[PDB]
Amino acid sequence: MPHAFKPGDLVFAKMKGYPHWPARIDDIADGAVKPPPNKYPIFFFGTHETAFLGPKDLFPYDKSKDKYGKPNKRKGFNEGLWEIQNNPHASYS
Ligand SMILES: CN(CC(=O)N1CCCCC1)S(C)(=O)=O
Known part of the structure; x- marks a missing residue:
């Protein structure tokens, strides 16, 4: 069965107005801005x-x-x- 999303997972990510887009779940670096609750940082x-x-x-x-x-x-x-x-x-980067 599936687990929750974790850093390094590969996805297509959907944003209003754009085609489903190749992307990954990123890590958050030490000292870097965290996402809002329930959100993941998506690198497109x-x-x-x-x-x-x-x-x-x-x-x-x-x-x-x-x-x-x-x-x-x-x-x-x-x-x-x-x-x-x-x-x-x-x-x-
Ligand atoms: C995150 N993207 C949409 C977006 O915000 N933008 C498009 C790129 C220029 C800034 C604005 S995406 C799915 O990679 O096209």
């Missing part, structure tokens, strides 16, 4: 943006890739697909 591949999202917007990558893992014209998306497939745990 390709754009390298962070937003705070709850589970309703997080789709596990293995289950969802056949549906959501296809090229999109949006800035940074295809770069994102390469990152999530080829080096999802690297430093993108």
Whole structure:
């Protein structure tokens, strides 16, 4: 059965107005800003943006890739697909 989300989990993350987007659950570094309660820090591949999202917007990558893992014209998306497939745990700083 599934566990709660944890840092390093890979997902497609959904934001109003954007296609389901390759992303990961990030860690929070020592001394770094924490997310609000019930929210996770989501690192979006390709754009390298962070937003705070709850589970309703997080789709596990293995289950969802056949549906959501296809090229999109949006800035940074295809770069994102390469990152999530080829080096999802690297430093993108
Ligand atoms: C987090 N993204 C949306 C977003 O806030 N923005 C898009 C990038 C420029 C700033 C505004 S995403 C899903 O990576 O496209």
